[PDB]
DNA sequence: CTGGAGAATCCCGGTGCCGAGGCCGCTCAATTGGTCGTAGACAGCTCTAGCACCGCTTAAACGCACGTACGCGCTGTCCCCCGCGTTTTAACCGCCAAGGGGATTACTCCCTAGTCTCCAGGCACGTGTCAGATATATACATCCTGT
DNA sequence: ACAGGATGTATATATCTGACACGTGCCTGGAGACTAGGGAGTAATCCCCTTGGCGGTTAAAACGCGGGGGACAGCGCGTACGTGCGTTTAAGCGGTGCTAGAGCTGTCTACGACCAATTGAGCGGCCTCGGCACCGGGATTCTCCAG
């Protein structure tokens, strides 16, 4: 009874605030959980090192910030970053 | 006197209680009185012992 | 525990045959179905020498599909749609 | 009285779960400490990346007439943006087929 | 009767394969070489079909994208006529060999 | 078509600023408004469409790459009726 | 500049005004305006009027008002001091949207209270467990500030 | 005046135990430290995956083994393990 | 007044330092706990490594009748043995160069 | 402010030349030339913009000769000799 | 006499010359005018390390013969012995560059 | 196919320089000795899924004939690239000088780890209906041989 | 080019079904309040490496000219591979049956973090000479044109 977790639930809403009635497949909702591990673990592993790097020993916003720059390619990074401080200014106001 | 909120000074003398002061940040930039706090209501500036050029620092709002 | 070495001839010539018109390819010459037998086994040891290996890390006795995930995510081809 | 329960991911307007961001994160063995703002940030990535690969996915569907999403259409939608398909150049998708196109020498030509 | 001239039928059929998305390899013989690839590492190995089902997706897009570059290096050497040079020529441009 | 050959000023105005139109780009939803008020909203609040909704992000990534944001048959037709 | 949307929002005000609601700047201060609203009909909060403060950031329309009660009132999803919890006002905001859109959802809002997100837990905790003394105390309340 | 480490000392070392009579450039001894190095960061991070996919949180030459196996090939990797395992024997012995 | 100071290296009768491997193991955001013999296993591995570079890279210097190892020697040490090509298949060294090839179809005849 | 520009050219024939001798290149075409410096050009770019966002992650105007190793190392073309 | 060699014959004696010295075989003053002129379009007054200009350069130059090889590959597999565009194209196509 | 000139290459020797190698503080990071909590080893029990088998259908593999298009060789052209000499240019080296910015130390303070308590959001489990698959009979586009 | 015949191929309608979108119970992981402490921001200072400049040498780049060999178009020939048709054969399905091993829980203990006290191994500095670069000169080889 070990109870596991992935995104579907999340995959689920952004589904549904981008295509309000479209549907998903089953396996197509497992492609995207490894996706998003995936991309997971690239940010995390490259904000690491970058912490790493300049004898850091914390993770903050300011290290996600270049490791996007550094992963996602042009304009998606710019898009990407654009969409991440917007995210943390809303946070950090309330 | 001056006042520093950490930012629009100054404000009142050591004579408004902390509700007062609020009011006037909300009226002065529109940031809400109770939010979120007050760091250094019904308490005053001298109560603290606030004086001249204080740095001050102002979560329920959701 | 008797499996010879016979079925790398069950990847039939119509079984590549089709993989290369998958992959776009107009015309096959004779010598491609050795070929093409000859690299798939390559490549499937190479992947199946470090799945073995994980699941022995693992104590386990059979190959779970994580391992092979893993597998081929070290060798720069990962793979959606397992875990 | 404490407060009422506010989810980080509803105070950053933000669908991925900041908190399980926040708990992988410092449970993954990548710093010793882990910022406030990290996690914040990192699910708004997170869900701008998959909301982009899910709006071309789902133009991709209904342009074949289908109201579900299968692995076809993913792979459809992220060989076709070239931005996509760069970042997952080096990524198989399950039953995913691959993108039609045949040289221009190969095709009939004469008269 | 009827009678298609060469080359047409192929290029159906690259039409057909590039707009499915099927395994285009049997099973039992592809689980069949699993099995038998597996069992000079350790003996008595067990497999879940999950496993062997990713073992043959990442074959069967490895190959095809094998074919996808040994196509265009036989076009470059001006021909039609796919044949052993040029998966070498691939192989060795990829860096496998 | 915005509509139209002669936009007059209540539609050359934008939908948004309500000034008159300064290197309109015209979205995939068909609304049209200004340079400004485009390159303000899109990563402003949610990179979607003020009036429908309508998710952008896709379009506008297309079309940043290839600098085809601004519409340039009624950017030169307005610069022809109007200053 | 958010001048030239607030003085054209505030003209089609004026061109269209409200029947139970009410609004504007109370000084020469655009950015400030003070908003008088009625309770809705078949409502506690029927028959008083609620004043309301509105201070809007510079970057209208692209950014939600700054608008709270400067009248006491019961209402879950509504603090002491006045704040509003509404998703147009901290997340469904959008540049395409009126005030009097705004305002027809408070009264909405204070006609239909969600205690699923409200700003008072114990009035939450009222309105789900006794409506009826919900609709008591805000009736009391509104007899007793709002008029 | 920070102190810093490199690997300079043990590769001359292993250098004079192997060809008594050789010398080595100073360049030369950057590209060994920049070899090690990599190598070292390959093994750990090798091992940590490991650690973390069969949910352990120790890493001990269990997992070192595994890791030689997967990033070296071949002969080199049997021979490495069957150098790692004598010195772990020796080690445990005293 | 307790003991002899005796390096983990020494006990293990190896060259690289365990005490510096194992710190730097610990300090490197591995794991949470390390194994007391992983510092050990990867000294090992470490020191075999580098005396099979070293012996390639000294054998290919006499070949070049010099006493002092250079990049050049480390470069045709590592490109001749097939085991280390395909490890450091994606390494690039500096002041290398390549190992001298000509194809047979360039040559006259 | 001291704006440069057509560096390009600095990459002289003769320079090409050598470099694909040592390539073991027997015969060149006039035009390997300008594509050479267009590959040329990509790879600088591609390898700076991850070298100059190191630099500035770390917050100072001096780029370093580590940053350009991670930026080569993150590429998959790990570099020695440098640290 | 004006004595000349064949076509050709030069161009194996300088292969061998170049395939065995260890050199950089790219001018270092235009090459670092060219890395400064395409980092001004990152951040402005950028300050470089000689001993960043030189990885920069040494991993640019290691890259180049790469790919010379690949694409002198191509060509003899062309039945020719002059590389021409296309046969870079070729393979930095199949590489996955392009 | 067999020789001589010449150009390049290789080889040996005398010389001078500077970087590899060794020595010496010396300090700080490794070692040693305890203690203490707990992650993991190991036994035990359950039941899921993997392996083994059989039988019937039939789709797919296999084998054979043919002839046509394609690979490969040959030949001639010619034009573009190589070898070489002369002229030009700017790389390179040495040197001096200014200072901007990288590299330390102190301090303080604010941000994050840790603990505790509470509850709801996400997970496991049913479930019924509809998107999609399959069949069949269409229209309709496509190829191919003859004209 | 053209037309008709044969052949795939897209289309519309009908019907089944099982996979998904939904709902419910629940529990444990996330949120809230709190305290404590050290990681890092900030300031200040130092000096080292970067940048900029200049003059002189000369190695390297640019240009040019001739000619030759190689890329390329063309052509002819043979063969081997695609296309089709008939004849095998296991893939596939389905069903049943068994049990090995995956997965879980419950203990308990050996082990690794932690901290305090001690010292010597490696880092920095400081040399010194010898391996290597260089310069010249003779000896060997390799190419190419006449024969
Ligand atoms: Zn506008
Ligand atoms: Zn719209």
Same mark, same amino acid.
């Given at each position: 009874?070990?109870?596991?977790?992935?995104?579907?639930?999340?995959?689920? !809403?952004?589904?549904?605030?981008?295509?309000?009635?479209?549907?998903?497949?089953?396996?197509?909702?497992?492609?995207?959980?490894?996706?998003?591990?995936?991309?997971?673990?690239?940010?995390?592993?490259?904000?690491?090192?970058?912490?790493?790097?300049?004898?850091?020993?914390?993770?903050?916003? =300011?290290?996600?910030?270049?490791?996007? =720059?550094?992963?996602?390619?042009?304009?998606?990074?710019?898009?990407?970053?654009?969409?991440?401080?917007? @995210?943390?200014?809303?946070?950090?106001?309330? | 006197?001056?006042?520093?909120? !950490?930012?629009?000074?100054?404000?009142?003398?050591?004579?408004?209680?902390?509700?007062?002061?609020?009011?006037?940040?909300?009226?002065?930039?529109?940031?809400?009185?109770?939010?979120?706090?007050?760091?250094?209501?019904?308490?005053?500036?001298?109560?603290?012992?606030?004086?001249?050029?204080?740095?001050?620092?102002?979560?329920?709002?959701? | 525990?008797?499996?010879?070495?016979?079925?790398?001839?069950?990847?039939?010539? #119509?079984?590549? =045959?089709?993989?290369?018109?998958?992959?776009?390819?107009?015309?096959?010459?004779?010598?491609?179905?050795?070929?093409?037998?000859?690299?798939?086994?390559?490549?499937?040891?190479?992947?199946?020498?470090?799945?073995?290996?994980?699941?022995?890390?693992?104590?386990?006795?059979?190959?779970?599909?994580?391992?092979?995930?893993?597998?081929?995510?070290?060798?720069?081809?990962?793979?959606?749609?397992?875990? | 009285?404490?407060?009422?329960?506010?989810?980080?991911?509803?105070?950053?307007?933000?669908?991925? #779960? +900041?908190?399980?961001?926040?708990?992988?994160?410092?449970?993954?063995?990548?710093?010793?400490?882990?910022?406030?703002?990290?996690?914040?940030?990192?699910?708004?990535?997170?869900?701008?990346?998959? @909301?982009?690969?899910?709006?071309?996915?789902?133009?991709?569907?209904?342009?074949?007439?289908?109201?579900?999403?299968?692995?076809?259409?993913?792979?459809?939608?992220?060989?076709?943006?070239?931005?996509? $398909?760069?970042?997952?150049?080096?990524?198989?998708?399950?039953?995913?087929?691959?993108?039609?196109?045949?040289?221009?020498?190969?095709?009939?030509?004469?008269? | 009767?009827?009678?298609?001239?060469?080359?047409?039928?192929?290029?159906?059929?690259?039409?057909?394969?590039?707009?499915?998305?099927?395994?285009?390899?049997?099973?039992?013989?592809?689980?069949?070489?699993?099995?038998?690839?597996?069992?000079?590492?350790?003996?008595?190995?067990?497999?879940?079909?999950?496993? %062997?089902? @990713?073992?043959?997706?990442?074959?069967?897009?490895?190959?095809?994208?094998?074919?996808?570059?040994?196509?265009?290096?036989?076009?470059?050497?001006?021909?039609?006529?796919?044949?052993?040079?040029?998966?070498?020529?691939?192989?060795?441009?990829?860096?496998?060999? | 078509?915005?509509?139209?050959?002669?936009? *007059?000023?209540?539609?050359?105005?934008?939908?948004?600023?309500?000034?008159?139109? +300064?290197?309109?780009?015209?979205?995939?939803?068909?609304?049209?408004?200004?340079?400004?008020?485009?390159?303000?909203? +899109?990563?402003?609040?949610?990179?979607?469409?003020?009036?429908?909704?309508?998710?952008?992000?896709?379009?506008?990534?297309?079309?940043?790459?290839?600098?085809?944001?601004?519409?340039?048959?009624?950017?030169?037709?307005?610069?022809?009726?109007?200053? | 500049?958010?001048? !030239?949307?607030?003085? !054209?929002?505030?003209?089609?005000?004026?061109?269209? #005004?409200?029947?139970?609601?009410?609004?504007?700047?109370?000084?020469?201060?655009?950015?400030?305006?003070?908003?008088?609203?009625?309770?809705?009909?078949? *409502?506690?909060?029927?028959?008083?009027?609620?004043?309301?403060?509105?201070?809007?950031?510079?970057?209208?329309?692209?950014?939600?008002?700054? %608008?709270?009660?400067?009248?006491?009132?019961?209402?879950? $999803?509504?603090?002491?001091?006045?704040?509003?919890?509404?998703?147009?006002?901290?997340?469904?905001?959008?540049?395409?949207?009126?005030?009097?859109?705004?305002?027809?959802?408070?009264?909405?809002?204070?006609?239909?209270?969600?205690?699923?997100?409200?700003?008072?837990?114990?009035?939450?905790?009222?309105?789900?467990?006794?409506?009826?003394?919900?609709?008591?105390?805000?009736?009391?309340?509104?007899?007793?500030?709002?008029?």
């Amino acid at each position: 009874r070990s109870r596991k977790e992935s995104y579907s639930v999340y995959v689920y !809403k952004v589904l549904k605030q981008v295509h309000p009635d479209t549907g998903i497949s089953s396996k197509a909702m497992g492609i995207m959980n490894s996706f998003v591990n995936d991309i997971f673990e690239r940010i995390a592993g490259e904000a690491s090192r970058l912490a790493h790097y300049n004898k850091r020993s914390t993770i903050t916003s =300011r290290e996600i910030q270049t490791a996007v =720059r550094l992963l996602l390619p042009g304009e998606l990074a710019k898009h990407a970053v654009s969409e991440g401080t917007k @995210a943390v200014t809303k946070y950090t106001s309330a | 006197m001056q006042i520093f909120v !950490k930012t629009i000074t100054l404000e009142v003398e050591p004579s408004d209680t902390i509700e007062n002061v609020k009011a006037k940040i909300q009226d002065k930039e529109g940031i809400p009185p109770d939010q979120q706090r007050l760091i250094f209501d019904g308490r005053t500036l001298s109560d603290y012992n606030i004086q001249k050029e204080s740095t001050l620092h102002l979560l329920r709002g959701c | 525990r008797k499996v010879l070495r016979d079925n790398i001839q069950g990847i039939t010539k #119509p079984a590549i =045959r089709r993989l290369a018109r998958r992959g776009g390819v107009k015309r096959i010459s004779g010598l491609i179905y050795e070929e093409t037998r000859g690299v798939l086994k390559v490549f499937l040891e190479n992947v199946i020498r470090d799945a073995v290996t994980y699941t022995e890390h693992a104590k386990r006795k059979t190959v779970t599909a994580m391992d092979v995930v893993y597998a081929l995510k070290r060798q720069g081809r990962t793979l959606y749609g397992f875990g | 009285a404490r407060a009422k329960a506010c989810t980080r991911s509803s105070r950053a307007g933000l669908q991925f #779960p +900041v908190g399980r961001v926040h708990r992988l994160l410092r449970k993954g063995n990548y710093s010793e400490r882990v910022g406030a703002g990290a996690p914040v940030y990192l699910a708004a990535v997170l869900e701008y990346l998959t @909301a982009e690969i899910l709006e071309l996915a789902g133009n991709a569907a209904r342009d074949n007439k289908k109201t579900r999403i299968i692995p076809r259409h993913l792979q459809l939608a992220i060989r076709n943006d070239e931005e996509l $398909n760069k970042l997952l150049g080096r990524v198989t998708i399950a039953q995913g087929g691959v993108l039609p196109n045949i040289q221009a020498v190969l095709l009939p030509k004469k008269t | 009767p009827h009678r298609y001239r060469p080359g047409t039928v192929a290029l159906r059929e690259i039409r057909r394969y590039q707009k499915s998305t099927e395994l285009l390899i049997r099973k039992l013989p592809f689980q069949r070489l699993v099995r038998e690839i597996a069992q000079d590492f350790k003996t008595d190995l067990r497999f879940q079909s999950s496993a %062997v089902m @990713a073992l043959q997706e990442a074959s069967e897009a490895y190959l095809v994208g094998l074919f996808e570059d040994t196509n265009l290096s036989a076009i470059h050497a001006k021909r039609v006529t796919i044949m052993p040079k040029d998966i070498q020529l691939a192989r060795r441009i990829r860096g496998e060999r | 078509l915005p509509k139209d050959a002669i936009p *007059s000023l209540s539609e050359c105005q934008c939908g948004i600023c309500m000034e008159i139109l +300064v290197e309109p780009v015209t979205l995939p939803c068909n609304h049209t408004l200004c340079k400004p008020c485009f390159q303000s909203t +899109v990563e402003k609040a949610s990179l979607c469409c003020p009036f429908c909704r309508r998710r952008v992000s896709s379009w506008t990534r297309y079309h940043t790459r290839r600098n085809s944001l601004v519409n340039v048959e009624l950017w030169t037709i307005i610069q022809k009726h109007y200053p | 500049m958010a001048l !030239k949307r607030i003085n !054209k929002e505030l003209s089609d005000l004026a061109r269209d #005004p409200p029947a139970q609601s009410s609004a504007g700047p109370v000084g020469d201060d655009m950015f400030h305006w003070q908003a008088t609203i009625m309770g809705p009909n078949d *409502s506690p909060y029927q028959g008083g009027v609620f004043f309301l403060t509105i201070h809007f950031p510079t970057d209208y329309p692209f950014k939600p008002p700054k %608008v709270a009660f400067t009248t006491r009132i019961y209402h879950p $999803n509504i603090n002491s001091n006045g704040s509003i919890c509404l998703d147009i006002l901290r997340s469904q905001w959008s540049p395409a949207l009126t005030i009097s859109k705004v305002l027809l959802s408070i009264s909405s809002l204070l006609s239909d209270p969600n205690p699923d997100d409200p700003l008072v837990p114990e009035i939450a905790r009222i309105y789900k467990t006794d409506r009826d003394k919900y609709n008591r105390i805000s009736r009391e309340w509104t007899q007793k500030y709002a008029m």
